[PDB]
Design a protein around this ligand. Sequence first.
Ligand code: FAD
Ligand code: FAD
Ligand code: FAD
Ligand code: TDM
Ligand code: TDM
Ligand code: TDM
Ligand code: MG
Ligand code: MG
Ligand code: MG
Lengths: 582, 582, 582
Amino acid sequence: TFISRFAPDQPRKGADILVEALERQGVETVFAYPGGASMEIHQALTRSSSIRNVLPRHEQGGVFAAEGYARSSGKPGICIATSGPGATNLVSGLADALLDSVPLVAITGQVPRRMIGTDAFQETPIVEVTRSITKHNYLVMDVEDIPRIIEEAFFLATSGRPGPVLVDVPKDIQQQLAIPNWEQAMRLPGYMSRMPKPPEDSHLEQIVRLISESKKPVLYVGGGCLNSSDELGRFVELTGIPVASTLMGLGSYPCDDELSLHMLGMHGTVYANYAVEHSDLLLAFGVRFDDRVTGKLEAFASRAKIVHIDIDSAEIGKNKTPHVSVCGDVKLALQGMNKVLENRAEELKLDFGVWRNELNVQKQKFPLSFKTFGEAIPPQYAIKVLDELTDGKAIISTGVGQHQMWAAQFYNYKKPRQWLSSGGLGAMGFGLPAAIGASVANPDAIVVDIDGDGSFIMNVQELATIRVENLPVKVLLLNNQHLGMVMQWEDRFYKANRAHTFLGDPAQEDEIFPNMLLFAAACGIPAARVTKKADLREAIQTMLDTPGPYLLDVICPHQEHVLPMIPSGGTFNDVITEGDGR
Amino acid sequence: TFISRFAPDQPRKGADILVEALERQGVETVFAYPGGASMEIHQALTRSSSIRNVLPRHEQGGVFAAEGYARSSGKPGICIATSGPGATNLVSGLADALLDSVPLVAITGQVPRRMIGTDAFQETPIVEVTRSITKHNYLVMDVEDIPRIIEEAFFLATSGRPGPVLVDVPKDIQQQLAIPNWEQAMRLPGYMSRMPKPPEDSHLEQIVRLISESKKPVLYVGGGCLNSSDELGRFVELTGIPVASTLMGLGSYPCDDELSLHMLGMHGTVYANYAVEHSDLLLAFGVRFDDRVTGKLEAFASRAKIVHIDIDSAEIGKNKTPHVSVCGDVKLALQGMNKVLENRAEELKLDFGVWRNELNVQKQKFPLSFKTFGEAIPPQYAIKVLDELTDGKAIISTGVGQHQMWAAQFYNYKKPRQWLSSGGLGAMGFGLPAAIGASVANPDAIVVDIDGDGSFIMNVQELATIRVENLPVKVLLLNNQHLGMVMQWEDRFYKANRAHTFLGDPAQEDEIFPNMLLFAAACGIPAARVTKKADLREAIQTMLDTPGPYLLDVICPHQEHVLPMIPSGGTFNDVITEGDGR
Amino acid sequence: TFISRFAPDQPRKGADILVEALERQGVETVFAYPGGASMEIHQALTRSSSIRNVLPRHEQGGVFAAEGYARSSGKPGICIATSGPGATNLVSGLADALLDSVPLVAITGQVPRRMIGTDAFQETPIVEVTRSITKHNYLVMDVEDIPRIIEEAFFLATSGRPGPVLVDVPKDIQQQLAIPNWEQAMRLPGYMSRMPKPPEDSHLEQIVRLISESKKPVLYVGGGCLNSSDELGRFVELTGIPVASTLMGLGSYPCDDELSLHMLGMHGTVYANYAVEHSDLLLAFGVRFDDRVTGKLEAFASRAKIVHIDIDSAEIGKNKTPHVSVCGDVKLALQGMNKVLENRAEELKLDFGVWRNELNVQKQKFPLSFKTFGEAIPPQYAIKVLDELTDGKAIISTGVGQHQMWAAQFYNYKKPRQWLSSGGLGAMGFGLPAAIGASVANPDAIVVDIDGDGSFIMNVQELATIRVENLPVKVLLLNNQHLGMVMQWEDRFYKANRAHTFLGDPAQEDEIFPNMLLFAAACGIPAARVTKKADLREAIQTMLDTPGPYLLDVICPHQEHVLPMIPSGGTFNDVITEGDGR
Ligand SMILES: Cc1cc2nc3c(=O)[nH]c(=O)nc-3n(C[C@H](O)[C@H](O)[C@H](O)COP(=O)(O)OP(=O)(O)OC[C@H]3O[C@@H](n4cnc5c(N)ncnc54)[C@H](O)[C@@H]3O)c2cc1C
Ligand SMILES: Cc1cc2nc3c(=O)[nH]c(=O)nc-3n(C[C@H](O)[C@H](O)[C@H](O)COP(=O)(O)OP(=O)(O)OC[C@H]3O[C@@H](n4cnc5c(N)ncnc54)[C@H](O)[C@@H]3O)c2cc1C
Ligand SMILES: Cc1cc2nc3c(=O)[nH]c(=O)nc-3n(C[C@H](O)[C@H](O)[C@H](O)COP(=O)(O)OP(=O)(O)OC[C@H]3O[C@@H](n4cnc5c(N)ncnc54)[C@H](O)[C@@H]3O)c2cc1C
Ligand SMILES: CC1=C(CCOP(=O)(O)OP(=O)(O)O)S/C(=C(\C)O)N1Cc1cnc(C)nc1N
Ligand SMILES: CC1=C(CCOP(=O)(O)OP(=O)(O)O)S/C(=C(\C)O)N1Cc1cnc(C)nc1N
Ligand SMILES: CC1=C(CCOP(=O)(O)OP(=O)(O)O)S/C(=C(\C)O)N1Cc1cnc(C)nc1N
Ligand SMILES: [Mg+2]
Ligand SMILES: [Mg+2]
Ligand SMILES: [Mg+2]
């Protein structure tokens, strides 16, 4: 039973209705940046005693913070911006939330209804702009539609395949006095009719049947299993099938486990890719067969009977044609199959020890490796130390590039919603703001931003946000003085021809530029720099032990390469296993 | 006669064709940020010995730099980004360039043609996204269309009413070998047929006729007169008509002149607004009657016979219905009218001395003013000192807010393309990157970024760009520790109720946060802070005299208000002339 | 005070709400064709005792009948169709109503809301299809929105510049029981803010001023003056300015008048075109400067000071740049100028007798002419007889082609809304159904369809409608056994090379095919055929005197050409005055 700050018969501003509509959705935290078209909303936010506002220093930082908030909780992330320049600063975050299927609700202010289409001051058709990069969007044309639209927005953003939903609110609507109706039905008849219903026992036992008929099966786990950690692990026990996870699905099945093949794909482990290459049954649960995982589709799982389970019917038979398909929640599909496997453990032989040992050979023959040059810090080693000193219980957010891959390879995530990274869009400057949102959603948790110097500087302004909001955000900055991932492709495919990849100062080459420590000092954040591998262990320990925000500038040799690697649109027999830029 | 780096019969990469297509457009400088979808382009850029690339630390900084490059030269600004996150980081700059009619060409990398529509890695329908915020955009579907599209892009961006044009280039097109045809005709039959032709002598002498029949005329000059400085001044001599300029039209007519009414509008001078209010003839040249200038249209120039000249036919009769209209280049319209006025000076009485003295009374009665509290630095005074110490010859770029208005009020711009500011979209974080582009376009010029602490921090990362590129960018930072313009509306309309407008640290209120000096130090840029008005003159002098980049952190009392002010959608009799937040 | 068939607190079907919504708009007649998706609506129509339904035999006939109903009354025309094939059969009528600015409301049935987008049975995104060919359209997503949308539909269709408005209604919405709210406000804030307000006395007396300063003025009257017959005639008396009318503006000023220059344009009279060519003041009232009137714009009224009055701001300065422009209702503009001319008749000389006599010379030198070959009936002569025997008081609807032009040239329409013809779209098969709708709107009026054999046969099925509905529709069929207008262009520009223009039977060339008399007999309509000019007078008399429907098959020599003629994109000095296909 909800308690309002207004009488049921009392006229309220549209902005007040909007905020209460958020309160009724259980919203505790928003990321809002003020402007003329959304001042009424911010005024109403102050009148709320339940909704906290974290003020970013950039709306892109605001929406990315809403993502990190969402990714590390399961709750929808809410960001608010003003019209024009404020709204257009959300675009990258919206597209990012769409490709990674992150539940997010964005509210943008807008010019009065009378001025829409006249190219007015700070006017942008943000609905027209964001239609192709959001799950759905709205343009409120009446104050009475506010309670309904907000309900529809949160419903669409969280249910089915999660995604970003934008609600554009005119300024005059915010000012208009009205009495809200909270019991009006949602106008989504088509969407709800197409919502997948619980899986039939028909489909489920056919899959279980295929499991016993195949003796070389591989689990293909992705971001669709982020809410099925228990059911998935229970499924693995009953089957004994090795697990290959994606960039988006890390943590679903414990990376330190003996049945774990870790990440598969372009920069996935060799033994994971080998498993899929020589599998006869592929259990694709909560994935979307991205080109970064498959390469050339015709060779990907060529001899494998493919089973695909997804809550989105559009993803089924999209890139790779499956044998058996189940459209629905994989959480329920697991529960259904789990009850069958235990009640039918006798009839089913179920022993893939021979196949497991075949993979375990590859797991020892071609394992993840890195070189240690003198006293120079291996970035792979630094992340491994962070794992040990945090016991793999730290929430990790990253930017995009070489550091992103190493953070996914050399950290054993034990539970989902611990790994926050841009995979679909792969947007830089995601790391720091995402850490901000995750720290707010999880106050008592260890939050570490494993960032690259290129990505870190893009939204470096959010360091001020961290200090002001007093968030214990740790920044493990892997500094290679380059746009590493771009540099790596240059060494591999372009004769190491440097095309604007060096981030330092061409007047003083061996001086670290910029001085990231002074960035932290500018925002009153304690920081330190480590260059030698010996001091690395103590340095990271200091970062963790020191209360509040901390920046550790870890200097790494730039010639390092992310291995292994499969060139875009290739096969498993094209895997690069050795080499760098030395 | 152009000299290529390739033989006329030699097959070249599409990326090489693209770069040469830019070379044939006279492009000397681009602002490109590398990524997987645009690596071929960056490789081809290095092979060019005429095109220089300035590497930003953020694509938003890249496109804003392209704007400042364009705004301070008249040449089109070129920015290049990769697919996905790179392209979406250009959005704000594109929308900004559209609303301020700035000639700009944006080139974005894209996934191969075979992968368009599959929600691939780093894929965003940027054409679909930017259609409503660009003049025009393209999606290259063949390597043979590159020379034509690029020619059409630069033509559309610079001709008629200037604007942003985006060209999306697939990765496979960049790699495809081909022989370019540079003599293919442009496919713009409709656009060129609708292009305004030189004004008839019929329309022009009717305007001249109205000039003599009215004895209280006012010139309404805007951003359409940026290329008519000579013709406009010549026109004023022949007529003696007082000149009211817009935010976008500053510098067209010298602000220090005795016939100058300076800026009109919401934050325009009282005597400028009074002139338009009590005019009988309004000469609207190169304007678009924005709501920030007119307020309520019915009261704006209510008793004035309105003459409107614009190169865009869609702007004629859009918001305010004109009496006489001339669709075409105002530069030619002035030249046509100028030759008439001098050859017909005898018949025409032409003496508005009585009307001029009527306005000159208002010019002394209600002039621009500011208070000086103790030793606290008035932001209005600081800008006035900068004017004196630069002799009004310094290129000024600003952010958005209170500092933006004061920089437009208390600096006398003598020539156009000296005032760089976001007016239509009004996007923060514009100041610093725009100064970067302007410094590249004008190396020997004094470039000063009059920025606010809120706007400055948004794209603060571009400080690294300034140092690396060794640009003599001066940063006059007016620090009020607040989002001032938002704070001002709070003091005026919301009982001074602070709704997330304070930018400092709520743990140490009277400490300046963040320490902007350390931001500059992080990027090896010399910086200083001044608090007392006495030290202000020497401090600004030091900033100017010190070679290379410099940051001056000017501390200002936050209670200051931009005056005068007309509330949104008001009349001239609603002007606020006194008051602040004390 | 409206009287409902339902209690204010009684739940009603959505279809019943829809019909009552029409009743509250004063709708007396609809043109509906039944289908599965609109059965509920047709059931509700029978429950109404005020709304009459005319059942067409084709939905294209239905919408064209709604046009004729609208064009000959000023009231909006209402047509109803089912989903899929029914809706797509309205398309031509919708596009036709848009280009001729005809007030029309189309209601289409639709699949249930749950099935929209699944390519269901008889599903077509008719909103998506008709968006570019309607003024506005709706998709009802809730039964509660029915009273509002219908009100907005009729308001948009009739106010401002009239046009077609489509309302798509899902089947489940029609079945859903609800209690309608008739006092809900319309959601058109932007549209109403942009609605032109009454013309200022400022603009009006400037026009009156130009009238006295020019001694060779010409009135350019179009379809915008259809509701200003009295005001226009009063204006002519006060000025004495000759009147040139368009295809859409016939009847506004009496064609038989001595000040009438009749039609101008491609097939307009020579003296009308001469007037505009050598005018110094062009009073363009209620026109849109179509290419069929101007040809090459640069030569059209080259030496004339152009005054343009239109209720659509988008039409001002569209093709031809005007000197003086007044955005608003021309009816009010005339009233405003009329009161000035009479109160200021003394000061104004106002005597264009010299210019009038100059035109009157051309009016006698190059008049409308036709040849009479033996006893063969001249189509021009037949129409002239119809004029005499109906005293120019008969409502005339036509098809498209040679007969359409002759019906506009050789019939003197005394009042507006007497001339019904497709001008903008120029759609064949318009004649017969439009006559149907006009006969229903005007029962006691003489309605004659001057049709061509090609156009007549396209919607010949509506002959059944005429008989069933017992409408006194007269059909003056001008039979040339060819697609004449297409044939004429062949004789003029393609060496008389027949490219599928003959409509008869290539097995019996001099036999009239098809036998149109048997078409009439099939629908129980009395008909006759006349071939010799002598019998023509009595034959037409019989058609008029015979009660009820009648078809007169008038046989004409096909070699006749519409004269004069200006080739597409030409000038006045390119007028073809003599010649045919003999
Ligand atoms: C530099 C870089 C390199 C990369 N290289 C790799 C790589 O080597 N390997 C790799 O794996 N990724 C890599 N990626 C990331 C890659 O681009 C994609 O992000 C990733 O492959 C997609 O992971 P996913 O399909 O498993 O999860 P998602 O993209 O999140 O897809 C989730 C799918 O599961 C479905 N789903 C969601 N919820 C449910 C539910 N409750 N029940 C059932 N189904 C559900 C959804 O409909 C959707 O189809 C890289 C990214 C970057 C930036
Ligand atoms: C915080 C803030 C406050 C503001 N307050 C004010 C204010 O008080 N006063 C004010 O004036 N502005 C103010 N603005 C800016 C305002 O929003 C608009 O940017 C500005 O009013 C538009 O100026 P403009 O129409 O003259 O020039 P533009 O917006 O650049 O329009 C140019 C017009 O001239 C035409 N044109 C272009 N080239 C030619 C040519 N060669 N020949 C003929 N025609 C041409 C174009 O078609 C166009 O119609 C403010 C902005 C901000 C951010
Ligand atoms: C075979 C053929 C040949 C043709 N040849 C000719 C020809 O020779 N000569 C000719 O004239 N036409 C000819 N046409 C027709 C031509 O294509 C156009 O239909 C016609 O020229 C347009 O007439 P109009 O602009 O005057 O009226 P409309 O097309 O109906 O335009 C009405 C205009 O007046 C405005 N308006 C409407 N209501 C009001 C109001 N209350 N107050 C103020 N303004 C208002 C509207 O906004 C609009 O701009 C021909 C058509 C066909 C099929
Ligand atoms: C420059 C760059 C990358 C280099 C990032 O530099 P970093 O310094 O942050 O990372 P790293 O050296 O450890 O690899 S990665 C990349 C990919 C994978 O497309 N892009 C393109 C890119 C460009 N701009 C944004 C916002 N996001 C992006 N991913
Ligand atoms: C926060 C803010 C403003 C305050 C800017 O803070 P500043 O510190 O930079 O400027 P100031 O104190 O001197 O006034 S101005 C404004 C307007 C006029 O809409 N917005 C909204 C806004 C929000 N985000 C962006 C990118 N651009 C914007 N203009
Ligand atoms: C065939 C034809 C025409 C010939 C019509 O044949 P008619 O027999 O009806 O008319 P006519 O001989 O007296 O000239 S006119 C025309 C124009 C002006 O575009 N079209 C093209 C046309 C084709 N189809 C439709 C529905 N409408 C059209 N106007
Ligand atoms: Mg790096
Ligand atoms: Mg500030
Ligand atoms: Mg015919």
